[PDB]
């Protein structure tokens, strides 16, 4: 996943600090079986936590166990991504994507 | 600059997978300098592929020149040592010297002998040296 | 072998009166510019 | 190691100066050229340029040898 | 790791300076690379500049590899941006001696450095994607970076990559506006450079709207048509308007542009027998010849041929070429007479 | 891409005056959809490969000359890398007597306007080099001696002067010495035009 | 000139020059007037496959 | 599968009988690490790292970029530099002491 | 392995004891605090001697953080004492970098201790009765405290504070008068050192009187004009007022001074091929130039140029100084010839 | 004396003549020019004539 965000931002100095699996291993094969029914791929999209339709910091998702954002009315930036929110004023810190 | 914006019809076609927390400052791999197998004298660069010992300069003039045996023994210099690519991320004691050409993971001797790749089905996989791997990517 | 080497020694006949000196010349650049007094004269 | 000559040179930067003068005469001779330089393979031109890179390497190494002692 | 207090982050850059000096001055290999990279660059500049193009290959490549070998053990970064000067040597001498597959990855290597300086300097993401967010940069001040992106795009058009050649030229325009202003003569020079590129690539269409901006800037921070004393630079640009607009196909409102430039150069250079004034007399002959109008383009062609005969010779390419315009006027007039006078059916 | 759009005036004339459907036979070259050879390719096979050795560029077969030459005072070129840790600098200038020396001379008024403009603020090291060049040209407390020892305090050290000779020989414009040769040429052309005036204009008319 | 069809390939200049430009760049002073000039038929190039 | 099956069952792929695909091929040794990141405090900030064999590197923007060290002048009034005219200013003043012993 | 070589070893556990004190007070003893502190200090002194300033900064900084984690913060009564040499190493290595304002409180704390030792020593036991301050009056002997004054005084010049360095140079003059007496060669050298600063900061005007008492004490102790044997230092200081009277204008009251400093250098250097004579020849040449005689200082300028080419480099700043003077003489003589041309 | 010999033009020229032969048209500026000691005419007597 560290190499994924390295490719998505095209730059070669990134690192993963800590991962939080917002999934279930049983959910992936049901996601795949629904996919083969729909006849399509599983292309990725890397979204900043405050880039969502409603802003939601990392402590909010983990505490109340839900994502409170309507994803049927949301654009999905795929592959190359914009610089994360928290740039020039903080040119080197820790950020978040999902 | 390939970037595509997607929009889905139904909310079931999107699933959360992970939140990744990522820093920004660069940071690089463990480039170790071994000392010697006999001497601990010079910043060490010569390697013998036959006898696996990273043993620059020092006593090579006197322990590797004995008979017609020790004369041949190619002495590939310039830090072309398979024991210099960093630790194994599971076992932080040995150095990555072998690489898998089926599952494609970096394996130290501990990571291949009783490591994750020591299973029953992980037996027929080709295992070339790591310097053979790096030269392969260079010449395509 | 011979013919070429012995002809080279016949070239040594006319280099006999030819001796290395003891000059030690360190050629270092020196610049010309300055007041030209034959102009002014 | 510090003593000066008739032109005011330490033994260290006398060598640095005559290396620069040898370099200026080098570029002058190569530009006027002989057709032995034109009749050179790419391997022999490689071996000449490795030769003058190492020649500059040992030139500075001798400069530091005549300087660091003093 | 033992997390630091903010007093260490307060000092910070003082520890930056005092370490990179000590290991530069103390290791003999650091001054080794600095001296040899200097002498190999001095030989490579004079090699490229006169006629060689092949010794300039090997000295640039050797200063590249010797710097890189130091840059892989002193610090864990092979590209450090300071190898741009002989990178520019490598690509231009590859393209001129001729081996494009060797200088293709050097143009590639020079490329990834350049957008990283554009993005690290600019206000944010903005424009200029494709080349990542942080990477090998150079700390050049911006008037230097203007000629850096301008020289790189010249190399991009030297190779067969016309798409990103125009991409870097418009950033060379937009970056000289930052240092000299939105209304500076140095910026009008920068627009004139891109207009020169569009003209040399046969693309006369996009060349003209840039030269209109060149004329607009020079008309403000310099003279004008009358302007009491006029200037030769406005007269040059007015000639460029008429020349580039005739090449598009419209000859009837390019005629006033050459008339203004002729009257200005009448008072800059005076006389009637200058090489400059015969440029615009020959331009009125060519403008007339496009829109019919015979027996008067003949005298404008004869005037510039008689001056160029007794000044430039009889076999000069500026005298034979206009004589070809005499012969091909003779073919065209014979065509017109054999198109509108034989119609007795 | 784009179509042909020929450059010679006659080929445009035949396209725009003569129609093909009026004769049984026709030389029909300025009517075909010839393609303009794309961009970079005309630069290789045409000769648009190097810097302009002259202050013009000839136009195809019409033998015209498209004028390109400098019009402005470019800031003096500095090095292709500055070793500098940010935060620790003094990029500002002591000013005062520096702009006093800017407004003294008259032959360099355009350079003085460049140093007082916003170009000095955006990049300060180019202003430092140009100020040292203007102060070097000043005519003649601290009797002799001091005035010449503080004069030779040259700022661009050994490495960057060669490293700017790169950026002059690769920059896509006029070559080095073309601008000075052009300036020398039209000055002499102007005095020849001034000679057929005055000594020929007023002297011969009103004797 | 990029204005006329090619008629002469000159190996010395390495150009697919036309007839009007042949007069332009080969009828200068005498040094460049003696280049071997052959038509575009005789330009060295590949024979081709079956 | 590996190399063994993908060569003999995909280059031939069940085809046969007239095809025949083509041919088959100072500065001595110290045990201390010479750190890549030249912050003197870079081994003394953190290691926020799930992997372990991973030192730091200096960022290309914030403190200073990776460079050779060819420039980097000290403070001008300090006498630890190349001799400026401000440093050779007191060359014709003669600060050498009389006697302290 | 990553041994983290021993000069940075004592950096590591010293910062670890900073954490240990902070997160759990009471697990600290005075013995190991000064043990790690003195090891950081002896390592910093051997680092500074061999030009290693990056680790001299690093150990002195972490010694100061450990200092203010101990008694400045932990147990309220400070009794500081040992601030000064490790603050010196911090202030010096700041000012060598570039520091105008980043070592400001570092200069202020060291100054506050140094001005304390000046006041409490100038007044006899002034600390015990009038304003007992925190500094220990250095708890050492007199001449070391003098070198501490001179160390800070040259540090203010490295912190571009000219007035502040001027006052500390002044108390350097006063206090070396007290320990060595009015007539001693140590005072003549210390007052000479202040003249080096006033030369270095272009303030030639007020530097004249203090070099004059340097001449007075050299004449009193070593020798006058004749003196039988002339000592090199009275020939030196008398040459120094010749250069000083030359630079701030005033051509008249320097010509006899240059003449007999030259004559004194004849007797100690009985040659003509030394830099001592061939710098006063440059001095008399400059006085010869300004009052006319264009073909009389040209000899004096060739006198010096044929020497500095012989004994110094061609690219030496002193040697190229003469060549710019000869290019000067080429164009004043050209202008004087032109003025002769229209006057004919 | 000749200073630069152009092999494409197979002629030997000085500095003042290289800038008037090859610096007139654009196809002549592309000619590579070598120093005059690379000239083919320096081997010469042709002992028959």
mmCIF file of C-alpha atoms in Angstrom, chain A residues 9-11 13 82-84 87-88, chain E residues 112 123-125 129 131-134:
data_model
loop_
_atom_site.group_PDB
_atom_site.id
_atom_site.type_symbol
_atom_site.label_atom_id
_atom_site.label_comp_id
_atom_site.label_asym_id
_atom_site.label_seq_id
_atom_site.Cartn_x
_atom_site.Cartn_y
_atom_site.Cartn_z
ATOM 1 C CA UNK A 9 1.586 10.613 -6.376
ATOM 2 C CA UNK A 10 4.369 9.634 -8.858
ATOM 3 C CA UNK A 11 6.995 10.459 -6.202
ATOM 4 C CA UNK A 13 9.958 9.371 -0.934
ATOM 5 C CA UNK A 82 -3.826 15.806 -6.483
ATOM 6 C CA UNK A 83 -1.386 16.812 -3.729
ATOM 7 C CA UNK A 84 -2.972 16.057 -0.345
ATOM 8 C CA UNK A 87 0.659 20.985 1.589
ATOM 9 C CA UNK A 88 2.915 24.037 1.353
ATOM 10 C CA UNK E 112 12.288 14.640 -14.453
ATOM 11 C CA UNK E 123 2.426 28.521 -5.595
ATOM 12 C CA UNK E 124 1.079 24.973 -5.593
ATOM 13 C CA UNK E 125 -0.099 22.281 -7.997
ATOM 14 C CA UNK E 129 1.616 17.917 -13.968
ATOM 15 C CA UNK E 131 6.642 14.753 -13.181
ATOM 16 C CA UNK E 132 5.573 14.279 -9.555
ATOM 17 C CA UNK E 133 5.337 16.368 -6.383
ATOM 18 C CA UNK E 134 8.803 16.142 -4.773
#
